[PDB]
Write a protein that binds this ligand. Sequence first.
Ligand SMILES: Nc1ncnc2c1ncn2[C@@H]1O[C@H](COP(=O)(O)OP(=O)(O)OP(=O)(O)O)[C@@H](O)[C@H]1O
Ligand SMILES: Nc1ncnc2c1ncn2[C@@H]1O[C@H](COP(=O)(O)OP(=O)(O)OP(=O)(O)O)[C@@H](O)[C@H]1O
Ligand SMILES: CN1[C@@H](CSCC(F)(F)F)Nc2cc(Cl)c(S(N)(=O)=O)cc2S1(=O)=O
Ligand SMILES: CN1[C@@H](CSCC(F)(F)F)Nc2cc(Cl)c(S(N)(=O)=O)cc2S1(=O)=O
Ligand code: NA
Ligand code: NA
Lengths: 847, 847, 29
Amino acid sequence: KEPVRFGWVKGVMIRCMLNIWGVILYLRLPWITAQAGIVLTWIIILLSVTVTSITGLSISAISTNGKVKSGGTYFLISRSLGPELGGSIGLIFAFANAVGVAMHTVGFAATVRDLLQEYGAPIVDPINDIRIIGVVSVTVLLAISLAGMEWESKAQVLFFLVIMVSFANYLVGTLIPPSEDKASKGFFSYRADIFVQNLVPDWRGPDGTFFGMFSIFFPSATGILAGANISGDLKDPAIAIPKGTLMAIFWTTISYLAISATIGSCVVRDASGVLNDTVTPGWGACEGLACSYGWNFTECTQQHSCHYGLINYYQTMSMVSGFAPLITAGIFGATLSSALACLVSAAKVFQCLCEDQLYPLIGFFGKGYGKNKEPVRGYLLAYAIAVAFIIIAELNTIAPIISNFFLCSYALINFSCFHASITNSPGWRPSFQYYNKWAALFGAIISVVIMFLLTWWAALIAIGVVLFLLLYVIYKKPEVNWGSSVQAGSYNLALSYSVGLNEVEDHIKNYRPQCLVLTGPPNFRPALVDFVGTFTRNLSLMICGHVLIGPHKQRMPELQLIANGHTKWLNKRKIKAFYSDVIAEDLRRGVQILMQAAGLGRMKPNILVVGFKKNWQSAHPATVEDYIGILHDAFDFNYGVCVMRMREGLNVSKEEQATTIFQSEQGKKTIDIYWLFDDGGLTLLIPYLLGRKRRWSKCKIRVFVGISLLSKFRLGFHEVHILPDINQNPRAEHTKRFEDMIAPFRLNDGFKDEATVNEMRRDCPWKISDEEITKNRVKSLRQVRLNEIVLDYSRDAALIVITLPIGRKGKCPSSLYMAWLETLSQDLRPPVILIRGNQENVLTFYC
Amino acid sequence: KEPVRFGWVKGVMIRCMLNIWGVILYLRLPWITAQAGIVLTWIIILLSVTVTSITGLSISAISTNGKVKSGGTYFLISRSLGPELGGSIGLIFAFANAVGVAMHTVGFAATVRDLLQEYGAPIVDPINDIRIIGVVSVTVLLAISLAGMEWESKAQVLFFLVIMVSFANYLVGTLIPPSEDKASKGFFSYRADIFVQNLVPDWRGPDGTFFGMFSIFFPSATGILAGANISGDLKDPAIAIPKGTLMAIFWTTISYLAISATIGSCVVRDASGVLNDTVTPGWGACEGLACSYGWNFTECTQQHSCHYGLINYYQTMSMVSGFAPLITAGIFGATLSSALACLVSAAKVFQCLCEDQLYPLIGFFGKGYGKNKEPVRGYLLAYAIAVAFIIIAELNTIAPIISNFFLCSYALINFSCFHASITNSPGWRPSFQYYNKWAALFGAIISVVIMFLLTWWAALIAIGVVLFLLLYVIYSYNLALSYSVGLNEVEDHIKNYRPQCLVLTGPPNFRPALVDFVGTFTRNLSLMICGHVLIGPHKQRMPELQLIANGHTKWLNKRKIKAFYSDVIAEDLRRGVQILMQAAGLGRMKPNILVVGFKKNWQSAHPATVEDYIGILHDAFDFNYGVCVMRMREGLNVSKEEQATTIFQSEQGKKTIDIYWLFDDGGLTLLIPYLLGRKRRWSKCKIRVFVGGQINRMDQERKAIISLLSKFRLGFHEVHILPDINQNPRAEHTKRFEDMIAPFRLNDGFKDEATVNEMRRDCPWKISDEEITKNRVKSLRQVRLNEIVLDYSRDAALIVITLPIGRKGKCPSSLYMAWLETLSQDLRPPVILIRGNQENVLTFYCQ
Amino acid sequence: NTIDAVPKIDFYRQTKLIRPTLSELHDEL
Ligand SMILES: Nc1ncnc2c1ncn2[C@@H]1O[C@H](COP(=O)(O)OP(=O)(O)OP(=O)(O)O)[C@@H](O)[C@H]1O
Ligand SMILES: Nc1ncnc2c1ncn2[C@@H]1O[C@H](COP(=O)(O)OP(=O)(O)OP(=O)(O)O)[C@@H](O)[C@H]1O
Ligand SMILES: CN1[C@@H](CSCC(F)(F)F)Nc2cc(Cl)c(S(N)(=O)=O)cc2S1(=O)=O
Ligand SMILES: CN1[C@@H](CSCC(F)(F)F)Nc2cc(Cl)c(S(N)(=O)=O)cc2S1(=O)=O
Ligand code: NA
Ligand code: NA
């Protein structure tokens, strides 16, 4: 009792041929032959099937790259292009099918109306018949659709047999020698003179032009997607869709080519239809080929007023036939089958669009009833939308809008095969190899050129609705991840441009501040993220380091989940930063690994920004040694450093995004820069880049000095000063404050040999000897003295930037250098940044 | 010197006044009022000014968001929608102004010519007099404009005064009681019955339509951006622009309403113009309303043959007014002010474009004289375009094309505001009270509707020129970085898996075979990095080190290998390869495969080096990496002009690729050869897959494997089966294995694990006897599988065997190296030993 | 489990017989 699955004949080919075949076979193809001649009609047919052949190749390539499921064509396009461009146009495909149901039931109601009028009495006026008949027949179609998916197939094969009987009837009729009723109306069976005369065009009327015939034929060679829209009922779609679609195209094209060339070799363009017009001996000389076959249509031809023949009578194909009502049965089948195919297609596509929740308020229609989970709620919606348009009943102006909703799907079926094939992601590997990448682009271009040629003001409606529904999904971010070629183009393009940096040398004219930020977990201290993402956005690189302190190195896959949870926090704050974490047994070695290996070619960090050890007085003195060693390692690797201190600390750990002070307008405060060393120009470059943004543009920056030097860079610097007095004894309380803060790090050895001091300094290298204290007294006094000047001139600034001191390695221990760093920036309101470049010409240009 | 600035009255409001004032105020509002009445002319005016006031709200919300130079009107489009649309729209907006200069100048030349022909004689042809006067006038306007922006701002206040004296002239003329001549043309003073008559439409002529009057008025109400194009010369652009711009619109629309409603109460719609219509009693009755004042106007009213009146005479204001030449003066001012305002706005935008760094299309025009900071080379471009279009003198067929350029600008400005406000862009945050994004979206929709309502074929040329420019400009560091940060939002799917590699290549010119092999399947597909570890104690980053790194990059680029280069410093090789695995890369472009060479001389090297060589693979497996080990007969190292040539640089031909797929590793062992065969040198190579299985299920398993490889779409040719995989090898091959595991054998009897560790702590690479006995079958399997491989794959182009992995702590590093040596010896072709990380890299599905 | 697995169809389907993780064939037991 498993649900029934279909083969390729009964499931794809029959459905596609029934959909393609319409009424233009029976009521307009002979007239097109009469107008344009045989040769130009064949050219119209071939130009028309080129587009739908290229689209068949594209949709055959798409559906042989995986396992196709119960979604139809929306499934293919959306899983090969993405939710934006797939869900924008899976909603107009499903609507255009629902209204094509109505526009194929109207064409059957008109035929029944004509049949009833010319036999007896009609029901009502000749427009409300179109309503009664159409509404009653769309209901039997709905009952067939709801009755199961194995009764739809029986109806389709019945319609197919009816159409083939029609073809046989016509082709038998064109061979019987003509009768009097038929030869008077123009039909003289196959002749060479009536075929040669009828090759050349003979245009007559307002719409008798080449483009006026193309515009009639082309929308009837379309509809090739019907059998691909039941992907969820086929045994193996990856082998059933490419065969069915392409053989349906081939065989319907052969049918179109045979009908025209056969009708145009038997029927003459002008004929009168009066049995008295048989030729009379001695009636001078007459007009036309029909004079040889013994008929006389001179008067008609001349006065231009005869009502029969290939170019005047629309049912020429019904009188050539051996029996007339069989052609009417063929016309019934050719319309009912297309209506049923559209009704099934719309409700299969809409259910899949409603299960993938991209749009609001339409979930209700995705429920599946019964064992095959048929869309019972989608059939009723397509039924309501079809009845609403049947009641309008004059759809001569709504047809161009709908026929352009279907050429906009043709342009995205062809863009899906062009994009997937030029992106070339490992993983796109289709079984169907008989397609091209440039033909699939020509198809996408020409389906829009044709869209505009057919009707300029309906192409606009199509494209406008496509844009509206595209932008809704773009602004909604529906969080679905199906492998898509747009997702695979981002990597292609990132790699393509990143490699291209290798072709450019290292120069002095392209310095950029590329910084490595030691944040730990980014949300534990977002102030660093904000400060650094202010001045480096859209200009250079920014990496957020993180060291996972611990004895086991093993990248179990759990780690990737945490890393992706930290990489989305930075994507939500709209920070343009990378995230990188490493494993090491202590923080110094993790930082050293990040400094050695991170980056990619020429895009690698050259500045190290790190917070400040707020708790260095309480923590075990083994941590201070490694903290200072980090800065020493940065200076050894030829980096530049920045130490950032805030009064309240940076670690906020001790949902919603937290807010810091670097996200807000500063005002008309000042940025104070204490330029004490010609480090190269980083100390002056960080505030110049920072203050040029909107939030800091209303501040004036006042560089101090320990005039023509600052001029040549064109840094736009406001004030220049001279520090009052840097080397004098400060107040005794400040000196004792420095002296007692460092005392718990003192060795108390009087004065001894340096080796002897090292003998007990080996176990604790952070101990300070009295000789080291004595021989670095002036510098310590300078550090304690400059704090008072900073307190004076910068009580109420918005940012203070001071030159960073360097302790002589070996002769300056860790605790004393850390005390210096503590004593240049204690008790200050603003953020304080201590910078020192790496002796490189930085200001050699603007940035 | 001191740069000149302007307030809001003289800098924004006056400019927008004079830009909006046109000839329509003088020559066509009386006609429109007669043709459509008062109450419906008011509707036209209000509907027209709604669009311009919504765009004014948008353009004044942009000005309270930062500060912009002159002509940065497009800078928001290029910030919100990319600097391609922005640049193209800026170029079109400047060109349209440059042509508007020509249109206003010829409109002034027509008036002066028609005045001159009356009071004198025309020296030359009517058409050429236009081409002389227009060129002279544009030259004089350029001379005024190019000589400072203080003189232009004085001329454009003289124009304001001339217009305001004409308003007073007209309004004092309407109050004087009519003269005998003036009443003979239609003028009677303000009176109620004429006002009541004229409240309702009276359509006459081929243009008497509501839309026929809208299409004439609406393009005469735009010009509100004349004050926002000089935001760089304003004193306070965030308070001056929103107020001046929005008050100018109000004060011009009040004037339009006042003039229409005050001339509608004043004249009659038609009048004879002859003085001999004195009315006397006796001749019938009077047919009209003018007879109540003593004038017979029946001669025209029945025959439609009078040349005066409100609906027939275009120059009614010249006679209603108390003095005629002042209205001519008003027209002169109203035209020259518009021409000047269009000439300065074109220069500002062209200069901003030529100075733009993100749009070089037209950045090479000329050298500009910035001594007085004038846009000289933005003035000489507008002057040339204006003079060309004046000489052409074809206008009325180019007016709609250029009226739609401005509406394209309006639509994209409003949509850029909406887009930046809906996507919460970080940097769009205006401070303007009355700004709503839904109004800024209605403005865009309406600006696009009106384009196609006014002239449909000129809105398809305006759009088709934006797309020509946009697609012509689309087709190093700033692109490498903006695309790498864009990868952070895409998620990872199994369909887009890329094999990124870390090649342990040393100096890339000691083993070119490794780089040649790995740069074959990763070319244009995925990341490749050439690692190098410099063994030495802690070493200073040095200038020479970067010189060496540049030399190796140059060598790589000369060979046209598309790879990155990276080197680290470490105490030994293993501890540096860990650094490279942990930190190399950038974001989502980080390696996940490790490629090494074969330790060719492990037999004779110091057995502590094989410990580290195997530890490298152990660490790779610890980090979730895939491993490839490559072997050649003659070794990889070639150190033992022209670059060296390997066998991977030549066409392989018809030989085969043999994949001994023995264990399921997720499919990397199948996906490396597939990508290798996607390239031109390996595309003619047959691929054979050998799998192991039983002897009673040869077919049952062969069909299953063929079915599996067909759902992956890989396209491999044969599938063989190996049933003799568990036999014993030949005796003299087992002996060859066991004599090689001898120097590494512990010979400890059979002791507990503690006793083994006792003598294995110093050397951990030796093999206990228990580990010899428990690894007997696993080892003879390698010995026999080598026999099978050498049996089948004697003359292939590439052999691929799945790599065994030994349990950490149950396989000493000499046993595992012995297995690796056994699997691949005595073979001619290159041998690759792949082993993925047990995660799927291949998929059946598409979702 | 503990021993490596020969190629098989069930490892790639979506719906038992899960291939061992790299930590199960490599980490010390
Ligand atoms: N696990 C880590 N990973 C990366 N960087 C770190 C880590 N721990 C500390 N850092 C860096 O070192 C700086 C100072 O070290 P310290 O441990 O004193 O900071 P903290 O005390 O954690 O936070 P705060 O400085 O706000 O009190 C930190 O601000 C941070 O920049
Ligand atoms: N300095 C290095 N940096 C990175 N990888 C290396 C380095 N030295 C060796 N390797 C990798 O290890 C493999 C084996 O190294 P080995 O010491 O055996 O050198 P070899 O010349 O390749 O072989 P052999 O020394 O046995 O002739 C090499 O092929 C290479 O891939
Ligand atoms: C005959 N049809 C023509 C357009 S004729 C104009 C019209 F009346 F339709 F507006 N195009 C398609 C295309 C497809 Cl692809 C499908 S279908 N069911 O495969 O998806 C159905 C049709 S059609 O039935 O509408
Ligand atoms: C009256 N003008 C109409 C165009 S109607 C005449 C036509 F061009 F169609 F031939 N629109 C605009 C728009 C702007 Cl924005 C500006 S301006 N200086 O602010 O940039 C100037 C003008 S206008 O003065 O040319
Ligand atoms: Na049909
Ligand atoms: Na003007």
